[PDB]
């Protein structure tokens, strides 16, 4: 039902805010995007750029993926992102996260026709 593209959007896109809304941001967003439903997803990145700008990365710098696949792409520009990292005292179902804002190049894995982001690999 949920496409790979739509799952990427749910897990990783947050164009509404320019930068990590608050110290609370990861706590709210990890829950609301349903990344704390089955377990506390330990780490997750949200990108604060337009969908079109993130989709365009699939046409940008081709780099090896962490898993050894070849279909990863690094943004030529830096992008506004928020890293969410589960605290050492977070216990499901009260998943707690540290919120960190950064401006970094993103690396995404792309697939399909159309060729679109399906996985967030890294920021550098």
From Swiss-Prot:
One of its GO terms (cellular component) is extracellular region. It is found in: Secreted. Endonuclease that catalyzes the cleavage of RNA on the 3' side of pyrimidine nucleotides. Acts on single-stranded and double-stranded RNA. It catalyses: an [RNA] containing cytidine + H2O = an [RNA]-3'-cytidine-3'-phosphate + a 5'-hydroxy-ribonucleotide-3'-[RNA]; an [RNA] containing uridine + H2O = an [RNA]-3'-uridine-3'-phosphate + a 5'-hydroxy-ribonucleotide-3'-[RNA]. Glycans are attached at residues 1, 7, 34, 37, 41. Keywords: Disulfide bond, Endonuclease, Glycation, Glycoprotein, Hydrolase, Lyase, Nuclease, Secreted, Signal. Interacts with and forms tight 1:1 complexes with RNH1. Dimerization of two such complexes may occur. Interaction with RNH1 inhibits this protein. Monomer. It is an enzyme of class 4 (lyase). One of its GO terms (molecular function) is lyase activity. The chain holds residues 27 to 150 of 150 of the full protein. This is Ribonuclease pancreatic. Pancreas. Disulfide bonds join 26-84, 40-95, 58-110, 65-72. Its main location: secreted. It comes from the Eukaryota. Belongs to the pancreatic ribonuclease family. The keyword Disulfide bond applies. Substrate binds at residues 7, 10, 41-45, 66, 85. It comes from Bos taurus (Bovine). One of its GO terms (biological process) is defense response to Gram-positive bacterium. Its EC number is 4.6.1.18. The active site is at 12 (proton acceptor), 119 (proton donor).
């Amino acid at each position: 039902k949920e496409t790979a593209a739509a799952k990427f959007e749910r897990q990783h896109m947050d164009s509404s805010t320019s930068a990590a809304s608050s110290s609370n941001y990861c706590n709210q967003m990890m829950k609301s995007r349903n990344l704390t439903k089955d377990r506390c997803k330990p780490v997750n990145t949200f990108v604060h750029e337009s969908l079109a700008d993130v989709q365009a990365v699939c046409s940008q710098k081709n780099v090896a993926c962490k898993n050894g696949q070849t279909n990863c792409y690094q943004s030529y520009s830096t992008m506004s992102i928020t890293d969410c990292r589960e605290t050492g005292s977070s216990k499901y179902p009260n998943c707690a996260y540290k919120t960190t804002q950064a401006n970094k190049h993103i690396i995404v894995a792309c697939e399909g026709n159309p060729y679109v982001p399906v996985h967030f690999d890294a920021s550098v």
